[PDB]
Design a protein around this ligand. Sequence first.
Ligand SMILES: [Mn+2]
Ligand SMILES: [Mn+2]
Ligand SMILES: [Mn+2]
Ligand SMILES: [Mn+2]
Lengths: 131, 131
Amino acid sequence: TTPSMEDYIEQIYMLIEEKGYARVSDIAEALAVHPSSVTKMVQKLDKDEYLIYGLVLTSKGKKIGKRLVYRHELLEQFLRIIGVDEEKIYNDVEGIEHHLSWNSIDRIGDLVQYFEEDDARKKDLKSIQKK
Amino acid sequence: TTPSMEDYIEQIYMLIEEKGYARVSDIAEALAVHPSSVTKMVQKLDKDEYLIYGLVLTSKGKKIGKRLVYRHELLEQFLRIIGVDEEKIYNDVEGIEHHLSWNSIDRIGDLVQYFEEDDARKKDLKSIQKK
Ligand SMILES: [Mn+2]
Ligand SMILES: [Mn+2]
Ligand SMILES: [Mn+2]
Ligand SMILES: [Mn+2]
């Protein structure tokens, strides 16, 4: 499971969740790539049993897509919470998401929980940004 | 400019700081790449005025290199402060360091400063890791 395959599964999962199905055309446009590039990855994903090529994810692909979508959202929340400009959050998440261990993700999970459970901590963090 | 050029500059900068000079052989071995690849990059770097081909960094290459080493250091401190297993930290930094805007880097800098001025915060976060 390379970062590119992950990106595709993340995208396919999202499309299925949003529209109810994933068309190579929708994937190609969503990733801003050529449909051939997409056709090649889909076949690779099929071979690896993440999906069945009417694009359907196997239980294996759903678990992964779900984890990948969860990781993306958590990473945006993380950067949002620490005060990163909203417009820059998405691009940063896209480039780092597929390069972090689960250990890092889980610890970032606890960090987000840390600030979300007590707003006083968010206020203190903001203070430091001013100093 | 480029995530790869950035990786070389960071490496060249480190070698100059450690040894006082940077050898193609030391670069090729540090990046785990063939000396030919390196030779091609250094020439690209020279054209762009980051250095002069032993090889010397120009004021532009030094400033960049210094920043990159700072970012690497901070990211490792970041992940360490939040509890990531040490063995996992280096590889995570290496893969996300060249994909974060300065905005994110600076906000992480404040986050690190936040946990540094009060151990109670570190302990509180550590608790959540138990929950
Ligand atoms: Mn992605
Ligand atoms: Mn994403
Ligand atoms: Mn690097
Ligand atoms: Mn580095």
